Amino acid sequence: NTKYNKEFLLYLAGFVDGDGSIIAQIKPNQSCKFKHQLSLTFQVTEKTQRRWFLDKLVDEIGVGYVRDRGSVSDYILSEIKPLHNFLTQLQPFLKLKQKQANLVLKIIEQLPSAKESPDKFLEVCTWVDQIAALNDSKTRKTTSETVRAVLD
Amino acid sequence: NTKYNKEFLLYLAGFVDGDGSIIAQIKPNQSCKFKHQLSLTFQVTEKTQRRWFLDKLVDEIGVGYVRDRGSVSDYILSEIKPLHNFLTQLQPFLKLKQKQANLVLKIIEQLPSAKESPDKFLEVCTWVDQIAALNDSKTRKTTSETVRAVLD
DNA sequence: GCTAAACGTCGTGAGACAGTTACG
DNA sequence: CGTAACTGTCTCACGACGTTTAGC
Ligand SMILES: [Mg+2]
Ligand SMILES: [Mg+2]
Ligand SMILES: [Mg+2]
Secondary structure, eight states: OOOOOHHHHHHHHHHHHHHEEEEEEEEEOTTSTTSEEEEEEEEEEEEGGGHHHHHHHHHHHOSOEEEEOSSEEEEEEOOHHHHHHHHHHHGGGOSSSHHHHHHHHHHHHTHHHHHHOHHHHHHHHHHHHHHHHHTTOOSOOOOTTGGGGOOO | OOOOOHHHHHHHHHHHHHHEEEEEEEEEOTTSTTSEEEEEEEEEEEEGGGTHHHHHHHHHHSSOEEEEOSSEEEEEEOOHHHHHHHHHHHGGGOSSSHHHHHHHHHHHHTHHHHTTOHHHHHHHHHHHHHHHHHTTOOSOOOOHHHHHTTOO
C-alpha cells in the first residue's frame, strides 16, 4: 500500500483527465450468485509507438499491466485494493473525472455488503450506472436495469 | 510576462500530453518575403459539452481564446510572446510533447533572424519538419522541401 | 463464487494542419 | 506588408465498453 509523489499525481491526474478512463461494468457471469460480477477499471490509452510511457506507469504506480490491441495500447488497473489505494490518492487532483473516481471508490467499499442483500447489489449497480452516465458512454449494454432480471 | 502556478502547470502538462497539440506550420502566403508565413499553435481539444474546461484555461493562462467546430471545441494560443512565455514555463513538465514544445521556443526565438535571410528561414522551416515528425502528422502538405522550391 | 488477466470493438473525441482573410 | 483570427475537416486515437480464459 504505497503513497505516491504529489507532483506525480498532479501530472497524471491531468493525463488521465486527457487520455484516461475510469470504468465500472456489470459483467454478466454465470457462476456468480447474482449472475453478474462487478468490475472496476482505471486505464490510460496511447498509440503503441508510445507504449513506453504506459510501461513506465506500471513501474511508478507499481501495480497493473499494459496490453496491446492494434495501433493502440493500454495501461490497465483493476485489482480492487491497489485500485482503491491509487484512486484515493489521485481523486483529489482530477477535474474531468473526479466524480467517476469517487463513485468507483464508493463501489469498492460497498463491495462486501453488496454480496449479501440482493437489493444492496442493485444500489451498487446504480453507482456504476451513474459512472457510465458521466463518461462519454455509447456502446453500453449491461446496465443495472438488466440486473432487474434477477427476479425469479 | 505572467508567472504561472506550478501545480496548474503540472496538471496542465499532463492534460496537454493527452488532449493537447503543439503545432508549427509553414503556410503558403504570397505577401511574405519568402512567400510563406511561419505559424505557431498551442491547443487543447475537448468535446464541446466540456468547453467550460477550455474557458477556464482562457482565464488561467490569461491569453488565448476558445473556438467551436461542431461537436468539439479548441482552446487556441498563437500569439508569439504569450506563447513563448507559456511554453517556457510548461515545457519542463511535459513528458510526451516536450521536444515539440522546445522546438517551438527555438523557432519563435529565430524568427527575426530567419526574417532577414532565405537560408535561416529555410533552416527554421526544417525545425517545423521535426515537430511534424514528432506528432502524429497525417495531412501535412507544405514542408521545408516545398519552401526550397523558392530557389529561383 | 468472485477476483482478474485476456481479449474484442462501437462511435466517437480528439489531434493535426489545410486554406483565406482582416488589420495593425 | 506581416502575425494572428476566422473556418474547414481529414483520419484517426483514443474512451467507454462487450466477451473469453485463467485459476484458486
Ligand atoms: Mg480526452
Ligand atoms: Mg485523448
Ligand atoms: Mg492523446
